[PDB]
Amino acid sequence: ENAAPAQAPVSDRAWALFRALDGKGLVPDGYVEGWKKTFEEDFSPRRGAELVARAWTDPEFRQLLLTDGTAAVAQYGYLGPQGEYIVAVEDTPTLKNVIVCSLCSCTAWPILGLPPTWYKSFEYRARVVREPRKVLSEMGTEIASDIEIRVYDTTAETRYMVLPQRPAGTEGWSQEQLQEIVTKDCLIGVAIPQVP
């Protein structure tokens, strides 16, 4: 009762699916290898960090990013699969934004990178919509009492990034220096950028 079905090892099943399709000529030469390279090397939170650092230092770009995220991201050439319609959401002294996909794992891949295991976890998918303050606290982020938490559930085609607040102690930093402190978790919204 309630037992798992018998299954071949997952690696054997995954490669079986590949071999079945490839053996029928349905997978172009170098196709999955090309995607692997895109997923590993091109889709990266370093891109989102670059956008945040630009927005922090360029008021004009900040306005563009917050009004037409797609156009702003396109200027850098960072539109892509699972990142074709972008909305950036602005943290403020009274508002903290956090992103989830409660129904599966929807993530702005090209600018955040593929989602981490924890983001796809049942724990995150179930809990952050209902108790984001506790979830963030457990993860190491204390949200001050005078700050509204707003959770964006990625349920359609909009793909989100958080524009976090710029921390004190970074005045005059270069874009490269600022990029370094905007991590993947800052873009998802579970972390606040940290100054050494």
Binding site: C104, T117, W118, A126, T141, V151, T155, E157
Partner: protein, 211 residues
Amino acid sequence: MDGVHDLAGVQGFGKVPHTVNADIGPTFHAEWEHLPYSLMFAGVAELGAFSVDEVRYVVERMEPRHYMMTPYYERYVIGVATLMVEKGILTQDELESLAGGPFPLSRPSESEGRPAPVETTTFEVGQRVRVRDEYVPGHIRMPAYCRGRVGTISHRTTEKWPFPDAIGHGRNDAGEEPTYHVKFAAEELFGSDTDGGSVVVDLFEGYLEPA
């Protein structure tokens, strides 16, 4: 579909397995893990055999206990394989032969889907809307926590997309609709039993009605 995948608001789970900025390791933790997404795109972009919405739905169609004990990337291996069998591209026999053992698939669909609604309203930023109190057995991009609930429009998309409840079943009548960022107060969704402020859900026009 009111399946176990509709996890938002479920109580009883423990801690999220992460502390902020902790090392998450490489993108892929095993040598097969890039295959589900790559082969999904082969199916969608190269073969034109199915939509991304159909991939979401086939994963929703995993037997519930099977879904709950299966790691993320493996669910997509199962889902893509299921679609290839359902579309007549592969057989389960050949998958199992190549795998060297059992390769159970998602369960067959119990709904033919539904068309894009004929009657909808164009909403504006600031307008109060209610999520239609409707029950859809096939694919739908409305998490149950917002069904019948009232919120305010914060964005109407400048692009339009096929209605998931149709294209998720491979139907010809998905049309195109914009979506709306609908902001709900936490208490509208979970009463006193929430520590949050607001939740914004990105909802197709066909899921909404004036408040």
